[PDB]
């Protein structure tokens, strides 16, 4: 399965599944500082799923590794901000992360295999 471009539609589909998850609600838009006025004190690089989707559709990811780095930043920012490991939003981030990692594994493997086949 050596299609070097297949990752992009696979990532669009996975983002659609993440938008249908109730666990994505808090991560679907850039954090509102009005509600969280200290957020940029703690979080140097905000990230959210709408920004990831727009960056993909603009053609501003070269590889699924770059998309994966931005999605992992959504989850690390939620760990950096949580006052507790028990909190609602942090618990939603951990379930959504497990879902994402389960689904991105094959996208990354197929892409890297396709690249190796191209360079053979
Ligand atoms: C505060 C929330 C959740 N959150 C956290 O990581 C977190 C962990 C513990 C407390 O907050 C950051 C993202 N947040 C937003 O408002 N984002 C805008 C939205 F929701 F419209 F997409």
From Swiss-Prot:
Name it.
Answer: PH-interacting protein
Residues annotated as carrying Phosphothreonine in the record are 45
Section of the entire sequence shown: 1315 to 1434 of 1821
Q: How does it assemble?
A: Interacts with IRS1 and IRS2. Interacts (via bromo domain) with acetylated lysine residues on histone H1.4, histone H3 and H4 (in vitro).
The Bromo domain is annotated at 2-107
Provide the disease association from the record.
Chung-Jansen syndrome: An autosomal dominant disorder characterized by developmental delay, intellectual disability, autistic features, anxiety, hypotonia, obesity, and dysmorphic features.
Origin organism lineage:
Eukaryota, Metazoa, Chordata, Craniata, Vertebrata
Expression by tissue, per the entry, reads: Expressed in myeloma and epidermoid carcinoma cell lines.
- Give me the gene this protein comes from: PHIP
Q: What does this protein do?
A: Probable regulator of the insulin and insulin-like growth factor signaling pathways. Stimulates cell proliferation through regulation of cyclin transcription and has an anti-apoptotic activity through AKT1 phosphorylation and activation. Plays a role in the regulation of cell morphology and cytoskeletal organization.
Q: Where in the cell is it found?
A: Nucleus
Q: Whose protein is this, by species?
A: Homo sapiens (Human)
Q: Which residues carry this modification: Phosphoserine?
A: 1, 91
Write the signal peptide boundaries.
Answer: none
């Amino acid at each position: 399965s050596y299609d070097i471009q297949a990752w992009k539609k696979q990532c669009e589909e996975l983002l659609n599944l993440i938008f249908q998850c109730e666990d994505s609600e808090p991560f679907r838009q850039p954090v509102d500082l009005l509600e969280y006025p200290d957020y940029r004190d703690i979080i140097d690089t905000p990230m959210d799923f709408a920004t990831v989707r727009e960056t993909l559709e603009a053609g501003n990811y070269e590889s699924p590794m770059e998309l994966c780095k931005d999605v992992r930043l959504i989850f690390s920012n939620s760990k950096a901000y949580t006052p507790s490991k028990r909190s609602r939003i942090y618990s939603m981030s951990l379930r959504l992360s497990a879902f994402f990692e389960e689904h991105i594994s094959s996208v990354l493997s197929d892409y890297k295999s396709a690249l190796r086949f191209h360079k053979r």
